[PDB]
Amino acid sequence: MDILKEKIDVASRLYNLNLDHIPATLQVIEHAMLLLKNNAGYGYFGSFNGKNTQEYHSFTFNGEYSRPVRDDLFITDYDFFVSGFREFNESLRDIGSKWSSFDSRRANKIIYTSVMSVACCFDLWKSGSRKTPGTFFEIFMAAVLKWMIPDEIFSKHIPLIDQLESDDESIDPSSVSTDIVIKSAYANASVVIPLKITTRERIVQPFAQQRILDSYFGNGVYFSFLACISETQQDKKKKKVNHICVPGTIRLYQKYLSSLSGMYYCDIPERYLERDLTDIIPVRTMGDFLFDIYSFFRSQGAA
């Protein structure tokens, strides 16, 4: 409960110190999962309604509700999740040769569960920076991306990215920038992975950053892939789920501000699945994310 924060802080500190943080981060997953399992109620909460219906569940504790959870996506069985996680782990070693839709669906479900397990724990036991789930999301992904392409350069900091993130934190201590830079060992090209659970008004931020990097380093050096969990919004009173989408804005951004290589969600909002977006920017999955990122580095750039 308060053991969870301590446990994150351990993994968070290892990460900043730039040490092997993966064991300590798995320990956070283990503990968040067992916490919800032994203390939290779990039921149907509300639905999103558009072209289709999407049902969402919530974890409960002493009245309080967690953010909405796609039950069809969250693995609510611990032993299931444990053996799932190991196979997910081994499939990343041979993603070059095999990456079926079953490999993608489970990578997606695993990432979702891992991040959302930590997130929901904070919604119920409200202890931490309130930006800690965002922090765990970065740490976790940094963990997985390391298992997968362990030969690419992780430990580079770029001055202008550090500038934007330092200044961001100096404004709002609760809204802090988590971006991952992976540079290719073999060519002068690298990816930049802005991580956010949900985007809200910070949707311009990856676009603006891409623009800045293009006009500072030149056009084919940095490629941005955006990783998210959802765009869900809880309406706690009416027991239903919104999807906060700005399709017009993203199109303006893609066309006239800057181009990103892709947008990725565990829980893709139904609105973002349409051609008005997908024509001009890939909107894929967190399982698709891993392959796309790997593919980029196999290609040595240019994707």
Added chain:
Amino acid sequence: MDILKEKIDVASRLYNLNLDHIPATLQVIEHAMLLLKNNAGYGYFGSFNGKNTQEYHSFTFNGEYSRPVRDDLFITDYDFFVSGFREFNESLRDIGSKWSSFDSRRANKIIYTSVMSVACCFDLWKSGSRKTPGTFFEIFMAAVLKWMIPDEIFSKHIPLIDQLESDDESIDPSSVSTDIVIKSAYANASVVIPLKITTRERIVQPFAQQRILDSYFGNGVYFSFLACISETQQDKKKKKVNHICVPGTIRLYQKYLSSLSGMYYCDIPERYLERDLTDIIPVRTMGDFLFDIYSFFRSQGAA
């Protein structure tokens, strides 16, 4: 108290309907001023400390405090303010011929007082959209800019600006975009005035917008001038005032994201007065703002 909101709503509705809103907006100033005068305590609150000291005052009511107010800037005498306002009004008619430092200082002090009088009323009597002071700031400035250059085209809406503002509001109903577009009657050029009391993380927003307009309409069609009140932040516990500045970020933004014509404050943060910013972007005053904007249109563009 609750009469103030009703009174703003009247002026706000006239404005959106695109009618003469100036009388109804002066009535809001009249009433906010008399409210603070008859009900509010007024004392020294705290200071900012850097290269120099800057003392700030606050209005009080039933324990509650208003945001910090530069006493040297706010006109706390009603009759003073009233005769001040009229002369300010007449000087805008002949700003071409005369605009001394005394004309600029009083324009600055008048704008400051008008906007901050409404703002502090909301901090004490907490009734309204919580974005209403921002709303009044736009309305007020739109009022003054109309007295000054009454021959330029105010009533144009640009699709892509409407898109960004509509989407902004759809995300956060409390954080809404207030930008003024004035198009020159005589040449294909116009200004875009993003208004914000303080900027916070929304500092990228005018830069990104400028970029988008340059890459959609071409480079010499839109020029952005940023109008603010301060960058003050209250620390209610320690009784002192911070200045939330991001000088590195604005430089990155000016150089690599987009160029704005100027940045204007009633209460310019001391940090923004340095050459590292002022070399690459004008950082002037709200009194200087009026002349600069007028100058732009006298020039018929290009400034």
